[PDB]
């Protein structure tokens, strides 16, 4: 196992050597929280994307921004994603994925 603590930023640039997951090739926002599981085994999160279903728990990663799992609720999932600062450096991006539901929004320019 490994510690999940982090002070400041300690962010790093993306590479073509790190773990290459099928879901890691798609945006983190494109995904939509489907459900959540909680039992003796622990707390897992169910999300849909890339034309399929995926399951990850605290510690795992998802999205091209390596969205790490930090929080898992019944109606929202807290995860830390990596995003650019605007010059070249990266930074942490705490985003919460709420359970899928009726909604709508336009698309973003920068991907």
TrEMBL record:
What does the UniProt keyword field contain? Lipoprotein, Signal
Q: What is this protein called?
A: PilP protein
Which species is this UniProt entry from?
Pseudomonas aeruginosa
In the UniProt record, what gene is named as encoding this protein?
pilP
Which residues of the complete protein does this chain represent?
72 to 174 of 174
């Amino acid at each position: 196992d490994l510690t999940v603590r982090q002070k400041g930023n300690k962010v790093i640039k993306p590479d073509e050597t790190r773990v290459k997951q099928f879901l890691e090739g798609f945006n983190i926002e494109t995904f939509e929280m489907v459900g959540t599981l909680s039992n003796a085994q622990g707390t897992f999160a169910l999300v849909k994307g890339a034309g399929g279903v995926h399951r990850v728990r605290v510690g795992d990663y998802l999205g091209r921004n390596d969205g790490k799992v930090v929080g898992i609720s019944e109606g929202k999932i807290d995860v830390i994603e990596i995003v650019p600062d605007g010059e070249g450096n990266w930074l942490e991006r705490p985003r919460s994925l709420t359970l899928k539901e009726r909604s709508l929004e336009h698309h973003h320019h920068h991907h």
